């Protein structure tokens, strides 16, 4: 049972990296830019209503 839950948990972490950004040690070395690209009009801001 232990290894199954281990594989499930590392599986579960990944789906959270997909849904949302997470901190992964921050910048490591020289800044190489946005790897996935910058999108002009997509705002991920949370608007106070």
């Amino acid at each position: 049972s232990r290894v199954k839950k281990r594989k499930k948990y590392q599986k579960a972490q990944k789906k959270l990296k997909s849904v949302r950004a997470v901190y992964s040690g921050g910048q490591s070395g020289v800044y190489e830019g946005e790897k996935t690209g910058i999108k002009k009009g997509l705002t991920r801001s949370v608007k106070f209503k």
């Binding site: 049972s1 232990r2 290894v3 839950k5 281990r6 948990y9 972490q13």
Partner: protein, 181 residues
Amino acid sequence: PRAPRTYSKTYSTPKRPYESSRLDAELKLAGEFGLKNKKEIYRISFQLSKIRRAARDLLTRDEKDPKRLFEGNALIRRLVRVGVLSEDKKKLDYVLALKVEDFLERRLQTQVYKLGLAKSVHHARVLITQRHIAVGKQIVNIPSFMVRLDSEKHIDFAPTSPFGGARPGRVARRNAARKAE
């Protein structure tokens, strides 16, 4: 015959095992702390709930009750000695502020991973159950061991362990003999 005996359960099933939040909580907890099944969390939750039930009883009592100062300061001393309750927060409302992951952090598995003796919680567990971890002079093989501060200090590899200075394991000497032969 002679008098029978009292024994008690260390855990209790939750009210509703089936909230998705609940299941995701055991998933996070077993993954982070390498727990075998849900019985360990049921045990820890039961024990913590008992402590909190006592603590709220004392918060109910008026300050300077003999019962209150007695029972609560005893609780604080014990929770400090197990290492869960820090020195600077010796008061019952902070006893009311604990969370189970502190108790899981006090599990010997967590220190074996944390101190650097093991590269993972599961590696810590296999090392412990395999008698490679000694608390001072004594070999311990239970991951659920609750480590004290003074016991936290003295975690090491056992003298009899191949990693602590004993002879190489069966595999090493077997391969060495085959290489020589």
